[PDB]
Amino acid sequence: IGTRWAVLIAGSKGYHNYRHQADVCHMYQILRKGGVKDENIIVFMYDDIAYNESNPFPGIIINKPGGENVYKGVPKDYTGEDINNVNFLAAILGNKSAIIGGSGKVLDTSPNDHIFIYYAXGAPGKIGMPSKPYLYADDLVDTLKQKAATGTYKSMVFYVEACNAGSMFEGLLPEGTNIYAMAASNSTEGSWVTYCPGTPDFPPEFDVCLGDLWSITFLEDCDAHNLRTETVHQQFELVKKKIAYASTVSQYGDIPISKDSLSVYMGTDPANDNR
Numbered sequence: 247i248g249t250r251w252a253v254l255i256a257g258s259k260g261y262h263n264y265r266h267q268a269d270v271c272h273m274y275q276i277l278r279k280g281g282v283k284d285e286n287i288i289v290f291m292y293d294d295i296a297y298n299e300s301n302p303f304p305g306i307i308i309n310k311p312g313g314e315n316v317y318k319g320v321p322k323d324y325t326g327e328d329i330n331n332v333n334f335l336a337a338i339l340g341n342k343s344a345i346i347g348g349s350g351k352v353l354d355t356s357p358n359d360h361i362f363i364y365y366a367x368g369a370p371g372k373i374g375m376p377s378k379p380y381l382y383a384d385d386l387v388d389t390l391k392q393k394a395a396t397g398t399y400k401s402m403v404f405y406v407e408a409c410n411a412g413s414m415f416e417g418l419l420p421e422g423t424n425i426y427a428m429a430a431s432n433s434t435e436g437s438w439v440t441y442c443p444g445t446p447d448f449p450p451e452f453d454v455c456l457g458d459l460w461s462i463t464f465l466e467d468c469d470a471h472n473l474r475t476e477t478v479h480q481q482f483e484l485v486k487k488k489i490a491y492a493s494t495v496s497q498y499g500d501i502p503i504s505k506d507s508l509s510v511y512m513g514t515d516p517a518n519d520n521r
């Protein structure tokens with residue numbers, strides 16, 4: 247019962263920030279393969295990578311060496327300077343009349359729907375937007391409190407790839423409104439980039455990192471398993487263990503929500519039914 251929705255947002259701009267847009271495009275491919283529909287996936291990506299004069303492969307974005315083109319077919323709801331706090335927060339709330347610029351696609355969800363939000367690109371108490379102002383912890387949590395008050399969702403999972411990512415939720419995110427959050431790092435740690443030049447077996451055409459460590463770890467995990475048999479809690483434990491040497495994967499909010507299979511939010515790719 248209900249519909250799966252998602253909001254994917256890369257909070258940065260500039261070719262050196264290739265990884266944030268590659269991470270978000272990779273998440274789109276997982277949702278598309280799982281049967282989540284484009285009308286229910288709101289994408290915020292600056293869109294300055296695929297056709298950049300510096301990109302050695304125009305029209306292509308990869309999130310791993312030798313990987314597939316993750317840019318192919320990704321919707322463009324909010325690009326360029328339309329990625330900002332006003333539009334990101336109105337999209338989460340689901341109020342089309344509060345969007346200023348962009349497609350107007352928002353989470354106009356119903357009570358049995360599921361929501362998955364993934365943000366990639368931070369400092370204590372804030373995460374980036376392509377231009378100032380940045381998004382502050384209190385303002386993001388206040389929007390989540392407004393969304394909970396409307397009652398227009400069954401449960402929500404929010405994944406954040408950023409430095410000090412846990413600072414967006416620590417001591418603020420409510421625990422009884424069906425919102426579970428997972429962060430690449432805790433409130434006082436930075437997060438790591440990965441797939442950078444100068445590593446064994448790396449495409450010689452690139453001078454930028456292709457992904458972020460926590461992101462490619464959870465994204466590649468989604469690609470390799472039947473999401474009906476892996477829960478959010480099992481992914482938390484697996485990814486937390488895998489990257490313990492770099493940062494402390496952290497969880498906040500309504501922890502029992504993580505008993506849900508990942509397919510509740512992402513669907514599942516029939517090619518991995520045996521895995």
Ligand SMILES: *[C@@H]1O[C@H](CO[C@@H]2O[C@@H](C)[C@@H](O)[C@@H](O)[C@@H]2O)[C@@H](O)[C@H](O)[C@H]1NC(C)=O
Pocket residue numbers: 341342343344345346
């Ligand atoms: C949906 O949003 C409407 C527009 O909000 C107004 O415009 C935005 C851009 C901001 O300036 C905001 O402060 C304004 O209030 C509201 O008129 C409307 O009541 C909202 N609907 C619901 C159900 O919340």
Ligand SMILES: *[C@@H]1O[C@H](CO)[C@@H](O)[C@H](O)[C@H]1NC(C)=O
Pocket residue numbers: 259260261262293294295297298299300
């Ligand atoms: C390409 O990347 C450069 C470096 O960040 C940026 O200044 C420029 O705006 C981008 N151009 C396009 C066409 O996306």
Ligand SMILES: *[C@@H]1O[C@H](CO)[C@@H](O)[C@H](O)[C@H]1NC(C)=O
Pocket residue numbers: 432433434435494
């Ligand atoms: C964050 O993780 C580090 C370990 O890398 C730990 O020393 C620190 O106490 C943690 N901070 C919080 C607020 O939990």
